């Protein structure tokens, strides 16, 4: 039924009663507990659960969403300043978690943009195919008479060729059947040909391009339609300019040579072509070879090669990094009272809010779940890019192509039958059949075919495009037919440079897992297989011109999770209109030069209020106006953040810190950046920032942690801190030991046992009781364990191999006759033995050396400031020996780094407490005190 | 919902709403949804995902 109703019958059915274990007999309650692990009774009894009916929601008209329009705004030349009055009514409590900007505008991306890696026009074409195009030349011509030579194909049959060109249609009876001639505009379509592999013979017609159109290979060729019937002809230039009703289309007729051939006095057509001038273009390809020096129409401009342009993905950064000024001078935010007017935000230059917020959401959810609201999508690489695992290709079956008829080459055969047998292949006596046709098409032997190792060329192609193109430009050369921009940060320069495919081929480091040596210093978040970047790019669209609407959160730690009480408040924030700073690229080309532009129209502030009951909201208002109920937060990366140069090709960084208190000091962290990839914060515009790839500094996507070989700590100028005899190298840390003869290396790479211990105590917090894989929540995206990748390979021993000849790239050959000569161009050469990689396996293996290294990407090295190198409390044990044995001491740190051929920075993080603490003592009043301990501001001025 | 309609319909329950929880709503296609009050439908010609 359903007849029972109201409260007594809602406690009878346990919709709104007491829980089971209050209504059950108390013998069954203890029986259930007794039997629980092998015969549960928990699912047999319904537990009520009632919402609170009063003092949790208001019945008054109150919005749950409010949109604050700007009260003042001014656009600068590269900044946008937007002020609001953020008001919180009486009995409304606001959380600053739920506030976010709405930014709308127009985004332009340069012509560098190309969110794909193929070509969109043709693409099944050979890259040598040239279209159907005629040219003029003197091949025996003289004067103003030029021979006109046409190369082409005429694909569709006809019935006759006359003065009206192809005749293919026919009219029905109305005064005989009239011919219908193909329209000039579009009728001999290039997509229509024969539908059979049996010839349609007769006459043929086709299309062609003028010699007024310049040749470009068929592969990425495009000409816009000029008719709604998909004609491509341009209008004739008349009296009234290019607008006319005429189209530039002519007819050129051809017949097979010879006087005997066709008429004796006639030379009737066999082929006709609708020549036309078009708006030919290559919107996404570039000519990678030509013999010529001028692009025109010529017999030698039939031969041209084409390659698609480099994929370049453009779109807003990971969490809208760099789209607001944080940690800046003269671009500081504001949150203040409306009457008080005193700012309650202080932003320091030794804070890194943007980096800090990456590390927060490491730890507070997964970063492999994309969110399109706040634009979350973490930069990444595929680990079959960065570390090349190679195993050859399974290709143990030949694969073939076959002709369409599949019977190879056929020849004429007449029938025969014996007149009466007698045995013999001519002596049984054979004679012609008249009931079996002459001219049968039979193929003796096996059908025609051409072998292709598909598997081989499927991994040849992939390996080239994800690795070779992203090699440094010290392995590239400019083609001998084109000129490139002087600027090396232009897209045009980058896709114009050509890399030999022999540098990285599927025939080197084979059977090894090993990142290439020139690919250890290339940022691996600047490639088209970065799937965080791809996501962000395609969440805007596929064209240059993108009107956008994005929602961008607050990130500054003081007011990120603040609960702002009743009162009226001035909120103001500044937004960067610098294209480099706000758009990531997959090549990292300078977008200012390229032509990207951005502008904002309409920035608003959202807020979301819990609709609390007025009674309950004013009880909580009163309680949080107390001076013992002050709201306190800290920066997640609570630290002093400092940069120090490393000169080019320099091996050490001398770092010295003045005498400083170290009370409540935590560890250090460090990572190496590049100067050009790091922008200068504390400036409204940095005009020398010409990068726009993944910024490691702010995105937390480091990749040069593996160039460190030592660090050393000294306090007082006389005491080594790792010098209480706690390490095998007893006065410094060594990160890499290259040349090991005490067996200090561990984990099958060049990394010391000492440092491996340290970086498993700083994270996992265990290493004194054996090493184990850390739990799933003890390791995260930026944790040490996940990004530690030992690797090794053998190479020829160049001193103890007695047939070692050093052959250069030029004099290496392998796939001779089946691949181009140091270029992605067509095949060249002869089948011949290879001579490139030296055998390392099987019989006739060469003597070899062992090379070992690791990569750590997305990890900062960290050394805790704890006697045992694991922290069992945020305020370290040596932070609390600086309340009794401190008076200020100097800290000098020495570092040894690998040489780099470009300027680099060292990023040393000194881990502190960043206390952001805030109190409201009255309505519309807000106060704060900001304090830090071992490094702090206001420690030598008021 | 008849085809070509933007008129999609409830103006029905005049019930007593004590103990009511939410609503949930979704749109189906007519020829993908059998009748379960009939024992056999001689008109359900779809065997795809219901």
């Amino acid at each position: 039924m359903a007849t029972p109703s109201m409260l007594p019958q809602w406690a009878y059915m346990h919709i709104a009663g007491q829980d089971a274990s209050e209504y059950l007999s108390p013998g069954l309650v203890q029986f259930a507990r007794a039997t629980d692990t092998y015969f549960s009774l928990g699912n047999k009894f319904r537990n009520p659960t009632v919402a609170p009916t009063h003092d949790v929601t208001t019945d008054r008209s109150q919005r749950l969403t409010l949109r604050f329009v700007p009260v003042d705004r001014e656009d600068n030349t590269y900044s946008y300043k937007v002020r609001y009055t953020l008001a919180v009514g009486d009995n409304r409590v606001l959380d600053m978690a739920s506030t976010y900007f709405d930014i709308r505008g127009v985004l332009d991306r340069g012509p560098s943009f190309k969110p794909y890696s193929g070509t969109a026009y043709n693409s099944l074409a050979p890259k040598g195919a040239p279209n159907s195009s005629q040219w003029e030349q003197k091949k025996a011509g003289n004067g103003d008479t030029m021979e006109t030579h046409t190369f082409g194909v005429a694909p569709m049959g006809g019935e006759n060729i006359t003065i009206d060109g192809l005749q293919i249609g026919t009219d029905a009876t109305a005064d005989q059947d009239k011919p219908i001639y193909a329209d000039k505009t579009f009728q001999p379509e290039p997509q229509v040909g024969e539908e059979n592999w049996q010839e349609t013979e007769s006459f043929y017609g086709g299309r062609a391009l003028k010699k007024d159109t310049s040749m470009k290979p068929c592969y990425g060729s495009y000409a816009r339609p000029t008719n709604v019937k998909g004609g491509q002809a341009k209008l004739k230039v008349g009296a009234d300019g290019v607008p006319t009703k005429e189209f530039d289309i002519d007819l050129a007729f051809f017949d097979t040579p010879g006087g005997t051939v066709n008429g004796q006095d006639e030379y009737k057509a066999d082929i006709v072509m609708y020549t036309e001038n078009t708006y030919l273009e290559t919107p996404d390809t570039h000519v990678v070879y030509k013999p010529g020096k001028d692009d025109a129409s010529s017999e030698i401009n039939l031969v041209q090669q084409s390659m698609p342009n480099r994929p370049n993905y453009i779109g807003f950064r990971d969490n809208f990094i760099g789209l607001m000024y944080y940690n800046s001078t003269g671009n500081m935010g504001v949150l203040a009272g409306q009457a008080s007017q005193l700012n309650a935000v202080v932003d320091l230059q030794d804070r890194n809010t943007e980096l800090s917020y990456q590390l927060l959401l490491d730890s507070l959810g997964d970063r492999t779940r994309y969110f399109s609201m706040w634009n979350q999508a973490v930069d990444s690489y595929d680990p079959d890019v960065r570390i090349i695992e190679n195993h050859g290709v399974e290709d143990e079956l030949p694969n073939y192509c076959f002709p369409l008829d599949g019977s190879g080459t056929n020849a004429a055969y007449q029938g025969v039958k014996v007149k009466n047998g007698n045995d013999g292949d001519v002596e049984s006596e054979w004679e012609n059949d008249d009931t079996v046709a002459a001219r049968n098409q039979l193929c003796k032997g096996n059908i025609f075919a051409m072998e292709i190792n598909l598997q081989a060329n499927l991994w040849r192609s992939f390996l080239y495009s994800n690795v070779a193109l992203y090699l440094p430009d010290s392995y590239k050369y400019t083609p001998a037919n084109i000129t490139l921009p002087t600027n090396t940060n232009t897209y045009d320069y980058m896709n114009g440079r050509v890399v030999p495919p022999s540098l990285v081929d599927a025939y080197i480091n084979i059977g090894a897992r090993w990142s290439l040596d020139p690919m250890d210093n290339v940022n691996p978040f600047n490639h088209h297989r970065n799937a965080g970047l791809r996501y962000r790019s395609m969440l805007l669209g596929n064209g240059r011109y993108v009107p956008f609407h994005i929602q961008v959160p607050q990130k500054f730690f003081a007011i990120k999770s603040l609960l702002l009480l009743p009162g009226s408040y001035t909120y103001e924030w500044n937004f960067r209109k610098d294209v480099n700073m706000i758009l990531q690229s997959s090549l990292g080309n300078d977008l200012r030069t390229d032509g990207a532009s951005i502008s904002f129209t309409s920035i608003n502030l959202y807020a979301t209020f819990f609709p609390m009951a007025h009674n309950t909201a004013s009880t909580l208002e009163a309680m949080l106006r107390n001076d013992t109920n002050d709201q306190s937060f800290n920066d997640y990366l609570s630290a002093a953040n400092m940069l120090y140069p490393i000169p080019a090709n320099a091996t050490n960084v001398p770092i010295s810190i003045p005498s400083r208190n170290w009370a409540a000091f935590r560890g250090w962290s460090f990572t190496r950046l590049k100067t050009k990839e790091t922008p200068s914060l504390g400036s409204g515009f940095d005009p020398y920032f010409v990068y726009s790839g993944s910024i490691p500094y702010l995105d937390g996507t480091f990749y040069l942690n593996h160039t460190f070989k030592k660090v050393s700590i000294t306090f007082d100028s006389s005491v080594s801190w790792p010098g209480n005899d706690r390490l095998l190298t007893p006065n410094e840390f060594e990160i890499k030991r290259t040349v090991d003869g005490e067996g200090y290396n561990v984990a099958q790479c060049n990394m010391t046992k000492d440092w491996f211990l340290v970086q498993m105590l700083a994270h996992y917090n265990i290493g004194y009781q054996g090493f184990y894989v850390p739990e799933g929540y003890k390791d995260r995206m930026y944790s040490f364990f996940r990004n530690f990748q030992p690797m090794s390979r053998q190479v020829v021993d160049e001193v103890n191999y007695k047939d070692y000849q050093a052959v250069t790239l030029a004099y290496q050959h392998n796939n001779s006759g089946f691949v181009g000569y140091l270029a992605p161009t067509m095949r060249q050469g002869q089948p011949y033995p290879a001579n490139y990689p030296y055998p390392l396996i099987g019989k006739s293996a060469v003597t070899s050396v062992t090379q070992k290294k690791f990569l750590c990407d997305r990890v900062m090295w960290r050394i805790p400031f704890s006697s045992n190198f694991m922290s069992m409390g945020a305020l370290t044990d040596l932070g609390q020996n600086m309340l009794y044995a401190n008076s200020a001491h100097a800290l000098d740190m020495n570092f040894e780094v690998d040489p780099m051929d470009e300027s680099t920075l060292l990023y040393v993080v000194f881990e502190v407490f960043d206390v952001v603490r805030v109190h409201q003592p009255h309505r519309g009043v807000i106060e704060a005190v900001y304090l830090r301990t071992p490094f702090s501001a206001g420690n030598a001025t008021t | 919902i008849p085809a070509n309609a933007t008129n999609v319909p409830i103006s029905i329950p005049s019930r007593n709403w004590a103990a009511f929880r939410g609503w949930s709503f979704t749109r189906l296609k007519t020829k993908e949804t059998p009748s379960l009050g009939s024992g056999f439908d001689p008109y359900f010609v779809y065997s795809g995902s219901i």
Partner: peptide, 7 residues
């Protein structure tokens, strides 16, 4: 919303 709660 759509749920079942029990012991």
């Amino acid at each position: 919303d759509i749920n079942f709660s029990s012991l």
